[PDB]
Design a protein around this nucleic acid. Structure first.
Ligand SMILES: [K+]
Ligand SMILES: [K+]
Ligand SMILES: [K+]
Ligand SMILES: [K+]
Ligand SMILES: [K+]
Ligand SMILES: [K+]
Ligand SMILES: [K+]
Ligand SMILES: [K+]
Ligand SMILES: [K+]
Ligand SMILES: [K+]
Ligand SMILES: [K+]
Ligand SMILES: [K+]
Ligand SMILES: [Mg+2]
Ligand SMILES: [Mg+2]
Ligand SMILES: [Mg+2]
Ligand SMILES: [Mg+2]
Ligand SMILES: [Mg+2]
Ligand SMILES: [Mg+2]
Ligand SMILES: [Mg+2]
Ligand SMILES: [Mg+2]
Ligand SMILES: [Mg+2]
Ligand SMILES: [Mg+2]
Ligand SMILES: [Mg+2]
Ligand SMILES: [Mg+2]
Ligand SMILES: [Mg+2]
Ligand SMILES: [Mg+2]
Ligand SMILES: [Mg+2]
Ligand SMILES: [Mg+2]
Ligand SMILES: [Mg+2]
Ligand SMILES: [Mg+2]
Ligand SMILES: [Mg+2]
Ligand SMILES: [Mg+2]
Ligand SMILES: [Mg+2]
Ligand SMILES: [Mg+2]
Ligand SMILES: [Mg+2]
Ligand SMILES: [Mg+2]
Ligand SMILES: [Mg+2]
Ligand SMILES: [Mg+2]
Ligand SMILES: [Mg+2]
Ligand SMILES: [Mg+2]
Ligand SMILES: [Mg+2]
Ligand SMILES: [Mg+2]
Ligand SMILES: [Mg+2]
Ligand SMILES: [Mg+2]
Ligand SMILES: [Mg+2]
Ligand SMILES: [Mg+2]
Ligand SMILES: [Mg+2]
Ligand SMILES: [Mg+2]
Ligand SMILES: [Mg+2]
Lengths: 23, 313, 132, 129, 208
RNA sequence: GAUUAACCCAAGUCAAUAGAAGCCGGCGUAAAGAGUGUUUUAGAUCACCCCCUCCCCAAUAAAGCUAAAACUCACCUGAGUUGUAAAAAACUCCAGUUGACACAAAAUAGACUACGAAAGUGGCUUUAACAUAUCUGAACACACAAUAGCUAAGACCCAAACUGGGAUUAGAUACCCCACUAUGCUUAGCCCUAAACCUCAACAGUUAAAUCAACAAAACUGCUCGCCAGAACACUACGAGCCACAGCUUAAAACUCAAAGGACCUGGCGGUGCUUCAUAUCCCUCUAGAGGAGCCUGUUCUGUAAUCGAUAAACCCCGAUCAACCUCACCACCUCUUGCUCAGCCUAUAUACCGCCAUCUUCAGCAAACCCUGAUGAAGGCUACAAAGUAAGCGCAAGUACCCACGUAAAGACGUUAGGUCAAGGUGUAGCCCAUGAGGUGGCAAGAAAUGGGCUACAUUUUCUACCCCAGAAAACUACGAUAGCCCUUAUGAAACUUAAGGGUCGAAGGUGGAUUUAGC
């Protein structure tokens, strides 16, 4: 299988961690 | 386009009646009118300049014209005549069966002028279409039959599938030795190099004089390499200073003329040397016409081979 | 890819004549010329005029025998004689073929100021060489 | 192939047909194209070996069933008899077994053809008188 | 080529043919009976059965030929051979009875030895590796060694450093220098050897 | 949208809204077996009968121990060592031999497949020690849970986030090199997360029937618990709990979309593998060139009142085997209106086309009609000691042309690039008709500049003359070198500073040309 569903979650989690760090 | 037996029978009746008509047209005896006469009369009455002869008018016997057709392979009841019909290759496999059967019987009991027929000739003896591997398998089986102690019955069979090939001897032809008014023996030959054409008369006895268009060879050929070419044939057979030559050459340049004379002298000189010496001249390249001639220029390119510059991209 | 005078392969249902089935490189090899005269020989004159006359006669005969021509015309010139040899079909009544022969021979003789003869060979249907 | 020559001769001697060579795709299911629209197919196919040379069922076993042709077949312990109409379990490898089978079928076929002529001939003689 | 593959090259060698039959081996006997059935190409208009034929000089002459002008190329060659011989006769007559023995006066012996003194034993090929081209010392076949010796000699004589000196005088002077292991063509060989030496560590980069 | 006709229903028609219409299906890859094990109340029939893998191999905890390799120290030798596609930085109380010497890690055995609930566990020894004589069962509990991380105190060989330096790069917050810290270790407490996946639940049973969407690790039955119900929002918000305070667990909704998703087939593509090769051909090699100078010619730009088309390979001395007028289609001005034509249009559209072509092709494939395989899916169809293909026709091939049977021409299918051409001619569609048509006069067609192709050169293998290869002269500021410039004459034409030829005058750049690049067997 491709990892396209993982990649969506990967970016969501990355952006969330960065938002939390920024705020 | 299938052709039935009744159709061919009618075509042969027409050819025999027309054969008598054609003989009557030309005022020749219809009884002694051969196929060579038919072809000659048809070429006169229907002149065709088409380069491909197969496209020209023809009046041949139906057997020569029409292709071979296999007859029906089953009767009214629908039963095939041959026990190998359902293979689709009954003629090929019947032959393999016959050759395989002979190889078995031998065990129970115990080149230069001929070649094997090609696939297209086997495909006509059998009247079937064959693969390339089918042809090989059949030949591998015939070769296996020669290596055995094949008898007379097993030799007439193998010869049916062998085609005599006419080897052409490479032995150089020799010109006749002629005699002049004074009784001096001489030979005459000709040579071509590029656009130069030479005719040389080599005398059996002489002092080594060579006349080219009436001129001394060293005055006619001031270039030393052109003179080496004249020396080459006589030097190779150890006959410098033993023959007189009078040759005429036209066309081409100085080098092409020296080459044309070299070939003309060598061919004429073959009349005065031993057969073994003539084969040495042949093997030395002295009796072969050089086929290397100028190639035409093609349109869209600078030369015979050179292309126009591939423009910078 | 070359296109000139090439009937292209199809599904095997298109009947072509012998004339149609041969590309130009077969001219003088497998097929002959449809007009024979002396204008294109070395040292001969009036090739341009013979060419115009030939183009007209082909168009003229196409429309004078509409739907009747089964193959290209063969044009023959001997001296001042002009012979037109045409392969036609057997649909038109013979009376119409005699009318059009008399009409065409006469009209063309006065047009080009030469004795013109028309030779008709009839076939039941267009002769098929192969199905491309 | 050890018995190709034997089997081809047995067929010719009994007046029947043999196909011991490579079997080309569609000899039976596409016979009209390969042979002609009026070609008559076999009424009975006898397999003396039901497997091909890669140890798989001979393609004609399946294709004989497709064309609704009954099949007689010698079926060894490694063969598949499901589609063979009249299977005969027996050794297909030993020359003694294979030779026997050829004698039996050859004899059965030769006797049956002779019987057909006897019956017909008697049926005609009695018909006239 | 206008010769079919069946055509074999002609063998122009008088000795090869006069050789007696008894001396022949069973292999050499087969080749001779075979050629009697083969097609033979016409002899090219260059090489003949002359005893004065030298394949090396004929090859050097062709490498000097510009635009198919063989007459001029041959003229320069014979002028160089004459210029070499005259320079050696002058050195010979001006020398002492002892030195005369060591002075060579045959221009063919000088020409051949001059080229053999310029043939390079090792060569360098460029090899792509790791994004940089590397010069790599590589053995050279004998054909390539002979060609390079000739090409370097002709190239040196065509150099513009020579002002108004004719080719027969330039080439004759370069041959006599190389005959004595001197001159710029010998230096060009030594440089190729020094560059191949300095690139000794890069020999492994070769894969053949 | 209008209009004509038609269709449906009909005193209705049907736009919006709402309702009617849904749980016995699933959980390897589509959503789903919750990281692991163990209850109660219960459920099951797999518990009595009735039976065959107890012990040992790398479970776990504790204590003790060490063979190989490091580090460090010492003596003796060496001047370098380290780093690699190749370098730099770095070290030089450095390196090599020998000896002494671990709170680190655990070759081979292991081609074994064992232990443990899982996580995990493969150096040695010893002690303790691996639940349940039905099964299932706690997300309301309890006890565990790799790596990373936190708190505190220690150890420290080596490795190593971060950081610094070196190098690479347009940049390089990377990949490559060096140094070094947290950290990996121990002790004592936390944290409770993994693609914790063998993505396949426990127990019992079966291999026969329908074997079976595909793929993967064949298809199922009984029973039970857990879980799932379009995508995305969302490992998110809020609430709650927690030694967690940038955390974990549980976990939505609004707005939005007509899909998302799983597995395959075909094709393309891969800085895609292996093998074998290319033959003027990819590299190396061979010869002469282009790229530098002048000139000729095309094109692009700029300019002009003043055409058009081609324009990566496959444009660029191309349509043109050819523009002073004409040609001519352009510009300016003037003139004609059933017009040389039973008109005309070089007006738009080559992305409507015929016609004739480029291109792969310096290819060998295209394909009707059948047959068979795949459960009768998109699709696929060969093995010669042959295993499902048979194949008309087309192309190649063969023949033919040229001097051979060689070579060179010619030929070269189906398709590819909506490739070129409406300006060869013809033509679909649209448009112009006192003008987008027709005619006349005159005129443009240049060069700041750039660029493609070619020509002639830079000379001594040359320059001039004789000759057509046995010569004489020339040879650097009067040499080589313009086919350019200027002047004159001539030729063609009605027309020539303009086109061509010749002569005179003039004697310039150029001194053999970088990266790159063309052709030839
Ligand atoms: K209403
Ligand atoms: K998890
Ligand atoms: K191991
Ligand atoms: K160990
Ligand atoms: K896994
Ligand atoms: K693919
Ligand atoms: K250049
Ligand atoms: K150029
Ligand atoms: K077109
Ligand atoms: K057009
Ligand atoms: K149009
Ligand atoms: K000058
Ligand atoms: Mg993958
Ligand atoms: Mg997102
Ligand atoms: Mg040339
Ligand atoms: Mg072409
Ligand atoms: Mg068996
Ligand atoms: Mg899933
Ligand atoms: Mg699990
Ligand atoms: Mg649990
Ligand atoms: Mg339990
Ligand atoms: Mg943990
Ligand atoms: Mg820790
Ligand atoms: Mg370290
Ligand atoms: Mg540390
Ligand atoms: Mg430890
Ligand atoms: Mg795991
Ligand atoms: Mg899971
Ligand atoms: Mg469970
Ligand atoms: Mg959802
Ligand atoms: Mg998470
Ligand atoms: Mg959260
Ligand atoms: Mg919260
Ligand atoms: Mg090339
Ligand atoms: Mg230039
Ligand atoms: Mg233009
Ligand atoms: Mg354009
Ligand atoms: Mg265009
Ligand atoms: Mg005008
Ligand atoms: Mg004009
Ligand atoms: Mg106009
Ligand atoms: Mg197009
Ligand atoms: Mg040929
Ligand atoms: Mg061609
Ligand atoms: Mg061909
Ligand atoms: Mg286009
Ligand atoms: Mg107008
Ligand atoms: Mg001038
Ligand atoms: Mg005049």
């Amino acid at each position: 299988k491709n990892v396209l569903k993982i990649r969506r979650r990967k970016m969501n989690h990355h952006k969330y961690r960065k938002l939390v760090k920024k705020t | 386009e299938t052709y039935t037996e009744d159709f061919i029978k009618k075509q042969i009746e027409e050819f025999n009646i027309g054969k008598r008509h054609l003989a009557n047209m030309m005022g020749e005896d219809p009884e002694t009118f051969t196929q060579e006469d038919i072809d000659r009369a048809i070429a006169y009455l229907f002149p065709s300049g088409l380069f491909e002869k197969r496209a020209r008018p023809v009046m041949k016997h139906p057997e020569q014209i029409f292709p071979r057709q296999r007859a029906i392979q089953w009767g009214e009841d629908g039963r095939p005549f041959h026990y190998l019909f359902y293979t689709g290759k009954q003629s090929y496999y019947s032959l393999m069966h016959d050759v395989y059967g002979m190889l078995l019987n031998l065990e129970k009991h115990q080149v230069i002028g001929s070649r094997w027929l090609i696939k297209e000739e086997l495909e006509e003896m059998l009247v079937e279409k064959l693969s390339d591997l089918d042809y090989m398998q059949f030949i591998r089986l015939l070769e296996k039959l020669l290596t055995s102690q094949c008898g007379a019955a097993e030799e007439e069979f193998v010869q049916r599938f062998r085609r005599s090939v006419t080897l052409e001897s490479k032995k150089q032809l020799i010109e006749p030795v002629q005699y002049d008014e004074q009784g001096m023996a001489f030979s005459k030959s000709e040579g071509k190099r590029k656009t130069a054409k030479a005719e040389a008369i080599v005398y059996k006895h002489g002092s080594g004089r060579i006349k080219v268009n009436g001129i001394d060879y060293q005055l006619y050929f001031p270039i030393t390499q052109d003179r080496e070419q004249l020396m080459f044939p006589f030097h190779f057979v150890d006959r410098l200073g033993k023959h007189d030559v009078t040759c005429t050459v036209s066309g081409g340049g100085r080098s092409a003329q020296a080459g044309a004379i070299r070939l003309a002298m060598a061919k004429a000189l073959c009349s005065f040397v031993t057969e073994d010496e003539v084969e040495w001249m042949r093997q030395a390249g002295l009796l072969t016409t050089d086929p290397r001639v100028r190639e035409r220029k093609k349109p869209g390119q600078e030369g015979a081979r050179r292309k126009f510059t591939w423009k910078k991209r | 890819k070359n296109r000139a005078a090439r009937v292209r392969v199809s599904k095997g249902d298109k009947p072509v004549t012998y004339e149609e089935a041969h590309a130009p490189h077969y001219i003088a090899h497998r097929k002959g010329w449809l007009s024979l005269h002396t204008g294109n020989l070395d040292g001969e004159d009036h090739a341009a005029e013979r060419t115009v006359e030939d183009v007209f006669l082909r168009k003229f005969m196409w429309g004078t025998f509409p739907g009747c021509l089964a193959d290209q015309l063969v044009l023959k010139r001997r001296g001042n004689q002009l012979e037109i040899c045409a392969v036609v079909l057997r649909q038109l009544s013979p009376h119409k073929y005699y009318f059009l022969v008399g009409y065409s021979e006469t009209l063309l003789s006065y047009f080009y100021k030469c004795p013109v003869r028309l030779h008709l060979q009839t076939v039941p249907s267009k002769v098929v060489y192969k199905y491309l | 192939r050890q018995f190709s020559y034997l089997i081809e001769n047995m067929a010719r001697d009994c007046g029947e047909y043999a196909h011991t060579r490579y079997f080309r795709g569609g000899m039976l299911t596409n016979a009209r194209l390969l042979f002609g629209p009026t070609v008559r197919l076999p009424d009975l196919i006898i397999f003396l070996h039901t497997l091909n040379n890669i140890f798989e069922p001979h393609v004609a076993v399946r294709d004989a069933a497709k064309m609704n042709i009954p099949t007689v077949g010698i079926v060894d312990t490694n063969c598949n008899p499901c589609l063979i109409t009249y299977p005969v379990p027996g050794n297909d490898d030993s020359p003694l077994a294979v030779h026997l089978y050829c004698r039996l079928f050859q004899t059965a076929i030769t006797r049956a053809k002779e019987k057909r002529q006897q019956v017909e001939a008697l049926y005609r003689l009695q018909g006239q008188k | 080529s206008r010769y079919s593959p069946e055509f074999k090259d002609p063998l122009i060698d008088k000795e090869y043919y006069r050789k007696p039959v008894e001396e022949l081996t069973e292999e050499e006997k087969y080749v001779r009976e075979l050629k009697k059935t083969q097609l033979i190409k016409a002899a090219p208009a260059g090489k003949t059965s002359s005893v004065f034929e030298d394949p090396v000089i004929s090859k050097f002459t062709n490498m000097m030929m510009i635009g198919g002008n063989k007459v001029l190329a041959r003229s320069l060659m014979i002028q160089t051979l004459e210029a070499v011989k005259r320079k050696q006769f002058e050195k010979y007559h001006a020398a002492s009875a002892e030195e005369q023995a060591t002075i060579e006066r045959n221009p063919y012996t000088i020409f051949h030895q001059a080229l053999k003194n310029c043939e390079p034993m090792i060569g360098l090929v460029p090899i792509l590796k790791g994004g940089r081209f590397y010069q790599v010392p590589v053995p050279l076949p004998d054909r390539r060694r002979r060609f390079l010796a000739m090409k370097w000699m002709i190239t040196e004589c065509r150099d513009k450093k020579h002002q108004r000196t004719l080719m027969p005088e330039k080439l004759s002077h370069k041959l006599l220098e190389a005959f004595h292991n001197q001159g710029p063509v010998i230096k060009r060989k030594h440089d190729l050897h020094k560059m191949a030496e300095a690139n000794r560590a890069l020999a492994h980069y070769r894969w053949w």
